[PDB]
């Protein structure tokens, strides 16, 4: 994926609710640093729904591709209010950005 393009997607669709940096603050949504390889609902210090805590998958390219297409379908009852990104290339670019940003 294209990290530069992914950053712009993130800014447009995600950044209002999420930070990515190490030590970044929780906002409407949890800080996303360290997500890759982590189970759902594991950012420290954030009140997740039980739905997000219980989903139990490991975040990575495959699961992010599916989630980000339609978040509430993947985690019904989530309090993340975002309808999804339909396009596969846009999700891949966003996920490439996330892989860099959330592991710096
Ligand atoms: C606010 C209006 C949000 C927007 C826009 C996006 N997200 Fe979000 N996200 C938000 C909340 C409140 C939560 C917690 C949901 C709950 O039910 O507890 C989330 C969660 C995520 C997660 C899961 C994190 C984890 O399991 O630790 C991911 C991976 C995530 N959000 C990513 C994400 C991306 C990439 C977004 C733009 C496409 C995005 N979110 C938008 C709130 C909001």
Curated annotation (Swiss-Prot):
Localization in the cell: Mitochondrion intermembrane space
Annotated keywords: Acetylation, Apoptosis, Electron transport, Heme, Iron, Metal-binding, Mitochondrion, Phosphoprotein, Respiratory chain, Transport
Inducing stimuli: Induced by lipopolysaccharides.
Pfam families to which the protein is assigned, alphabetical: Cytochrom_C
Modified residues (N6-succinyllysine): 55, 72
Any one Gene Ontology molecular-function term assigned to this protein's record: metal ion binding
Keyword set includes Lipoprotein: no
Modified residues (Phosphotyrosine): 48, 97
Tissue: Found in embryos and in adult liver and heart.
Stated family: Belongs to the cytochrome c family.
Alphabetical list of PANTHER family matching this protein: CYTOCHROME C
Function (record text): Electron carrier protein. The oxidized form of the cytochrome c heme group can accept an electron from the heme group of the cytochrome c1 subunit of cytochrome reductase. Cytochrome c then transfers this electron to the cytochrome oxidase complex, the final protein carrier in the mitochondrial electron-transport chain.
Protein name: Cytochrome c, somatic
Protein's organism: Rattus norvegicus (Rat)
Encoding gene per record: Cycs
